[PDB]
């Protein structure tokens, strides 16, 4: 019943709905990661807050995709949201590894949707991914890689803790 | 691995996890209702915004339950989130009916959790439901009932539209 | 006599001049639509103002294309501007239909210019259309589709008028 | 000589006086814990300040119970206050363990007073415990559990210190 649809393939429409699922699944993973770190026997509030903010960001990405689906005259379709892959998330290092794997999977999904958009000659879709997704994901993955290295440094050794503290207490 | 748990039954712990599922399912229903009203062939932005706000409120209720689960030393466990019951939501009247049915089901779930809390002599749980849930649900259901009556009045007849307009344009 | 031209095909240069014509023709259509709604026997000032603003937006798009033509070292060439397709525009519904047809034709022209830019390996042109045209057109076409649905709802029936008024007077 | 007493059992009146004793005993324990940490050979001022604030909070709880005793027309009766269980409090971990044991004992006393209030059909008493005691105790016990885990993490190992520092210096 759309009167607006133009140059918007059914292939991209379906891929957008799948990507909304993937972003909401990611948001739900981050909600689980955050509340795990809020447990009294884990009790790292900053890590809870880090993942709570990422749950928000992933929800917001899904909402942006849904708004765009309607802007193009496609039909938002929702599927079941699978529960996160784990119920307990181990150490901060374990959790940050799981997060980077998750973000890499979203980034690959964005790249696959660009490939589809390019094959379907859909420049509005490409511009949309560029405006709101591709560089956001690269920045977040770089931050997570930085965090993995610093966690690895801090937990690994005296030299590494000392080097971290110098950066923080003398330079910053 | 909790060192804090006191007077918190495994029955309530499990019921709280189920209620988190129900609230997140409700939030996901409201996300679908809102984006339906944002379709170009439906195009009632105020109804989209009404349900978008309720998606937020239901998410927030789930997050409050999860925070409380950790405060009591229970273990948050997440399950799959089923997709909403419909993909298209009909008219504003259809949608507001579906919303009141949904809110009634959450209210009954809250009342069942009070019954369990009372049976388990858990006054902190009871106080928690009173502080953040029971009156919030009654207020929202009353608002929805008011909206059902006004939608029914507006769509039904000339007399009803005229009466609505008098309230709005002469009295308010 | 340009000393700046680089990677700018004669094909794109010509297509840009044609697109300036199409945008100025659109602006002139909107000027006619707006003054039609200002007639004393039509007298819908809000519809006049809506189309007056679109006349401005289409002029501004043409001016942006002309600035870009000079930035690239092409030569702006102007042709005659044909008068709008009608002298009287019927009802608000008739007019909004004509507007969406017009905007669709501009959007297809933008997509055709992207195809040409891609074939000519001209990424500055592609970036220019993305920055200032493609999403602007999709947003405007979605707004127009929303308006068509609401006009259709309002003129069509009691149920539809009532539903519109609920959104506006109770929710907004 | 009360002219106001209504629905206030002698059982609850006595239990309230006992609970005032328990809260003042707790306040006195916290005063001893705080000044222990202020010793020059212990010298952890933040731990002194943490327990000094809890001494204040426990005094304030006792004063609230006494105000309520008079509001209901019962008679405040004071007994001797026993000295705290230890004269020296060991390490921060030892002290935080002793504190959580203390708070658990107050929480159980509050739950026992709810049981008595419910048996005596005294809803004002129940509302009073809900308003000012039950959730305050759960929040404080959760904070103490968080602190036990972080102390245990910090004192236990290199990995644990590193993880703590990451939360604090990189995330917070
Ligand atoms: Au969290
Ligand atoms: Au947090
Ligand atoms: Au692309
Ligand atoms: Au593309
Ligand atoms: Au630092
Ligand atoms: Au530092
Ligand atoms: Au520092
Ligand atoms: Au919405
Ligand atoms: Au909305
Ligand atoms: Au209850
Ligand atoms: Au209860
Ligand atoms: Au009104
Ligand atoms: Au009104
Ligand atoms: Au009015
Ligand atoms: Au006008
Ligand atoms: Au006007
Ligand atoms: Au292009
Ligand atoms: Au290009
Ligand atoms: Au309105
Ligand atoms: Au209105
Ligand atoms: Au109104
Ligand atoms: Au002190
Ligand atoms: Au102190
Ligand atoms: Au009670
Ligand atoms: Au009671
Ligand atoms: Au810190
Ligand atoms: Au720190
Ligand atoms: Au720091
Ligand atoms: Cl969280
Ligand atoms: Cl299903
Ligand atoms: Cl493309
Ligand atoms: Cl929404
Ligand atoms: Cl499963
Ligand atoms: Cl109870
Ligand atoms: Cl005009
Ligand atoms: Cl000529
Ligand atoms: Cl290109
Ligand atoms: Cl002190
Ligand atoms: Cl004595
Ligand atoms: Cl009672």
What φ, ψ does residue A162 adopt, rounded to 5°?
A: -65, -40
**Hey, what are C126's tokens?**
């592609």
The DSSP symbol for B84 reads P
* Of B32, B107, B16, residue with least CA distance to B69: B16
Long-range contacts of D47-51 (CB under 8 A, 24+ apart): D47/D92, D47/D95, D51/D95, D51/D99
CB contact under 8 A, B42 and C149: yes
CA distance A167 to chain D (A): 10
Please indicate if the annotation marks D45 as binding a ligand. Answer: no
Non-local (6+) Cβ contacts of D160 within 8 A are D152, D153, D154
**Hey, what are D33's tokens?**
């814990």
Residues D94/D51, Cβ–Cβ less than 8 Å: no
Cα→Cα distances C20→A123, B126, C17, C25, C52, Å: 20, 69, 5, 8, 19
Across the interface, of D145, D164, D165, the residue whose CB is closest to A164 is D165
Residues A164/D169, Cβ–Cβ less than 8 Å: yes
**What is the Å distance from ligand 15's center to C146 Cα?**
21
Long-range contacts of A66-71 (CB under 8 A, 24+ apart): A66/A20, A66/B31, A66/B35, A67/B35, A67/B38, A68/A16, A68/A128, A69/A13, A69/A16, A69/A17, A69/A20, A69/B35, A70/B35, A70/B38, A70/B39, A70/B40, A70/C142, A71/C138, A71/C139, A71/C142
Q: Confirm whether D5 is domain-assigned.
A: no
**What is the Å distance from ligand 6's center to D94 Cα?**
28
Q: Confirm whether A2 is domain-assigned.
A: no
CB contact under 8 A, A71 and C139: yes
Sign of CA dihedral C123, C126, C128, C130: negative
Across the interface, of A2, A70, A124, the residue whose CB is closest to C135 is A124
Which 3 state secondary structure label does DSSP give A23? helix
The DSSP code sequence of D85-119 is S-S---SHHHHHHHHHHHHHHHHHHHHHHHHHHHH
Do the two chains B and C touch, given a threshold of 8 Å on CB pairs and at least 3 pairs?
yes
The DSSP symbol for A82 reads P
CB contact under 8 A, B128 and D135: yes
Residues in chain B: 172
Neighbours of A25 (CB within 10 A): 23
Q: Name the one residue in this structure whose structure tokens are 């023709």.
A: C25
B141 burial (CB, 10 Å; 0-12 / 13-18 / 19+) is: middle
Q: Residues of C with CB below 8 A from B35's CB?
A: none
* Of B82, B71, B63, B80, residue with least CA distance to B12: B71
* Of C50, C65, C61, C64, residue with least CA distance to C26: C61
CA distance B133 to B65: 10
CA distance D106 to D140: 11
Q: Name the one residue in this structure whose structure tokens are 């608000």.
A: C92
Do the two chains C and D touch, given a threshold of 8 Å on CB pairs and at least 3 pairs?
no
Residues B7/B122, Cβ–Cβ less than 8 Å: yes
* Of B47, B172, D150, residue with least CA distance to C171: B47
Q: Confirm whether A1 is domain-assigned.
A: no
Across the interface, of D108, D114, D142, the residue whose CB is closest to B71 is D142
Q: Name the one residue in this structure whose structure tokens are 């000012």.
A: D132
Full residue range of the structural domain in which residue C67 is found: 10-171
Across the interface, of D146, D169, D171, the residue whose CB is closest to A168 is D169
**Hey, what are D120's tokens?**
């005596």
- Count CA atoms within 13 Å of residue B22 on its CB side: 18
Please indicate if the annotation marks B103 as binding a ligand. Answer: no
CA distance A28 to B105: 23
Q: Confirm whether B92 is domain-assigned.
A: yes
* Of A44, A94, A149, A154, residue with least CA distance to D162: A154
Which of A37, A48, A154 would best serve as a mutation to test chain D binding (most D beta carbons within 10 A)?
A: A154
CA distance B141 to B111: 14
The DSSP symbol for D79 reads -
The neighbouring-strand residues paired with A81 are B81
CB contact under 8 A, C162 and B168: no
Which 3 state secondary structure label does DSSP give B16? helix
First to last CA, chain D: 58
The DSSP symbol for A83 reads P
CB contact under 8 A, D164 and A45: no
Q: Name the one residue in this structure whose structure tokens are 């308003």.
A: D131
CA distance B163 to C165: 12
* Cα of D64 vs its chain's centroid, Å: 13
**What is the Å distance from ligand 25's center to B34 Cα?**
42
CB contact under 8 A, C107 and A6: yes
CA distance B111 to B117: 10
Q: Confirm whether D2 is domain-assigned.
A: no
Helix (H) or strand (E) holding D58: helix D45-72
CB contact under 8 A, A155 and D158: yes
- The C-alpha angle with vertex C121 and arms to C116 and C123, in degrees rounded to 5, equals 95
Q: Residues of B with CB below 8 A from C168's CB?
A: 46
* Of B55, B36, B44, residue with least CA distance to B102: B55
CA distance A149 to A145: 6
CB contact under 8 A, C145 and A72: no
Residues B44/B92, Cβ–Cβ less than 8 Å: yes
* Of B156, B140, B60, B158, residue with least CA distance to B102: B140
Q: Kindly identify which residue of chain C lies nearest to residue A124, measuring between CA atoms.
A: C134
* Measured torsion, CA atoms of residues D139, D144, D148, D151, in degrees rounded to the nearest 10: 110
Which 3 state secondary structure label does DSSP give B81? strand
Residues C113/C69, Cβ–Cβ less than 8 Å: no
CB contact under 8 A, B83 and A87: no
CA distance B73 to D146: 11
The DSSP symbol for A91 reads S
Please indicate if the annotation marks C45 as binding a ligand. Answer: no
CA distance D21 to D15: 10
Which of D145, D146, D147, D148 would best serve as a mutation to test chain B binding (most B beta carbons within 10 A)?
A: D145
CA distance C114 to chain A (A): 8
Across the interface, of B42, B93, B155, the residue whose CB is closest to C158 is B155
**Hey, what are A116's tokens?**
């589809």
CA distance C51 to C36: 10
What φ, ψ does residue A81 adopt, rounded to 5°?
A: -105, 115
**Hey, what are A146's tokens?**
């930085």
CA distance B30 to A40: 32
* Measured torsion, CA atoms of residues D83, D84, D86, D89, in degrees rounded to the nearest 10: -140
Q: Confirm whether C1 is domain-assigned.
A: no
Residues A51/D153, Cβ–Cβ less than 8 Å: no
Q: Confirm whether C165 is domain-assigned.
A: yes
What φ, ψ does residue B81 adopt, rounded to 5°?
A: -105, 115
The DSSP symbol for A3 reads S
Resolution in A: 1.5
Q: Residues of B with CB below 8 A from C148's CB?
A: 40
Q: Kindly identify which residue of chain C lies nearest to residue B168, measuring between CA atoms.
A: C169
Helix (H) or strand (E) holding A98: helix A92-119
First to last CA, chain B: 58
Residues A16/A69, Cβ–Cβ less than 8 Å: yes
* Of D118, A82, D134, residue with least CA distance to B130: D134
Non-local (6+) Cβ contacts of B12 within 8 A are B74, B113, B116, B117, B120, B122, B125
D171 burial (CB, 10 Å; 0-12 / 13-18 / 19+) is: middle
CB contact under 8 A, D134 and B123: yes
* Of A126, A113, A117, residue with least CA distance to A20: A113
Instruction: Round the CA-based radius of gyration of chain C to a whole number and report it.
Output: 19
**What is the Å distance from ligand 15's center to B23 Cα?**
50
* Of A17, A142, A135, residue with least CA distance to A74: A17
Residues B93/B148, Cβ–Cβ less than 8 Å: yes
φ/ψ bin of D133: left (φ > 0), alpha (ψ from -120 to 50), beta (otherwise): alpha
Q: How was this structure determined?
A: X-ray
What φ, ψ does residue D39 adopt, rounded to 5°?
A: -60, 145
CB contact under 8 A, B147 and C170: yes
Residues D107/D59, Cβ–Cβ less than 8 Å: no
Cα→Cα distances C14→B3, B44, B77, C110, Å: 76, 42, 63, 14
Across the interface, of C148, C158, C167, the residue whose CB is closest to B47 is C167
Which of D134, D144, D148, D152 would best serve as a mutation to test chain B binding (most B beta carbons within 10 A)?
A: D134
**Hey, what are D8's tokens?**
């206030």
Neighbours of B9 (CB within 10 A): 18
Neighbours of D123 (CB within 10 A): 11
How are the residues of chain D apportioned to helix, strand and coil, as percentages rounded to the nearest 5? 75, 0, 25
| Residues of B within an 8 Å Cβ radius of D | 2-4, 6-7, 70-73, 121, 123-124, 126-128, 130-131
Domain with residue D130: its CATH number is: 1.20.1260.10
Number of domains chain D contains: 1
Neighbours of B53 (CB within 10 A): 12
The neighbouring-strand residues paired with B81 are A81
**Exposed e or buried b for every residue in C91-100, given b needs 16+ CB within 10 A?**
ebeebbbbbb
**Hey, what are D132's tokens?**
């000012």
Residues A111/A73, Cβ–Cβ less than 8 Å: no
Which 3 state secondary structure label does DSSP give A81? strand
CB contact under 8 A, B151 and C163: yes
**Hey, what are D56's tokens?**
């204040």
CB contact under 8 A, A38 and B70: yes
**Exposed e or buried b for every residue in A28-45, given b needs 16+ CB within 10 A?**
bbbbbbbbbbbbbbbbbb
**Hey, what are D163's tokens?**
């993880």
Q: Confirm whether D99 is domain-assigned.
A: yes
Across the interface, of B40, B93, B164, the residue whose CB is closest to C145 is B40
| Residues of D within an 8 Å Cβ radius of A | 142, 145-150, 158-159, 161-172
* Helix ranges (DSSP H) in chain C: 10-37, 45-72, 92-119, 123-129, 135-156, 158-165
Cα→Cα distances A21→A27, A164, B25, C119, D130, Å: 10, 38, 14, 35, 41
Cβ contacts below 8 Å, chain A against chain B, sum to 78
Q: Name the one residue in this structure whose structure tokens are 């009634």.
A: B104
* Helix ranges (DSSP H) in chain B: 10-37, 45-72, 92-119, 123-129, 135-156, 158-165
**Exposed e or buried b for every residue in A137-148, given b needs 16+ CB within 10 A?**
beebbeebeebb
**Exposed e or buried b for every residue in B24-40, given b needs 16+ CB within 10 A?**
bbbbbbbbbbbbbbbbb
* Of C66, C54, C67, C79, residue with least CA distance to C137: C54
Binding-site residues from annotation of A for Fe cation: 53, 56-57, 60, 63
Cα→Cα distances A63→A70, A111, C9, Å: 11, 19, 40
Residues A147/A135, Cβ–Cβ less than 8 Å: no
The DSSP code sequence of C56-98 is HHHHHHHHHHHHHHHHHT--------PPPS-S---SHHHHHHH
Residues B113/B61, Cβ–Cβ less than 8 Å: no
């Amino acid at each position: 019943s759309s009167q607006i649809r133009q140059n918007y393939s059914t292939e991209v429409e379906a891929a957008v709905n799948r990507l909304v699922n993937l972003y909401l699944r990611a948001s739900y993973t981050y909600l689980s990661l955050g509340f795990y770190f809020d447990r009294d026997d884990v009790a790292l509030e900053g890590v809870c807050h880090f993942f709570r903010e990422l749950a928000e960001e992933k929800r917001e990405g899904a909402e942006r995709l849904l708004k765009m689906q309607n802007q193009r005259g496609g039909r938002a379709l929702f599927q079941d949201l699978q529960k996160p892959s784990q119920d307990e998330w181990g150490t901060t290092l374990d959790a940050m590894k799981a997060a980077i794997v998750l973000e890499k999977s979203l980034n690959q999904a964005l790249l696959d949707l660009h490939a589809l958009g390019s094959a379907q000659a859909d420049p509005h879709l490409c511009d949309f991914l560029e405006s709101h997704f591709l560089d956001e994901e690269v920045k977040l993955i770089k931050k997570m890689g930085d965090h993995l290295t610093n966690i690895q440094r801090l937990v690994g050794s005296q030299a590494g803790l000392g080097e971290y503290l110098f950066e923080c207490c003398t330079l910053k």
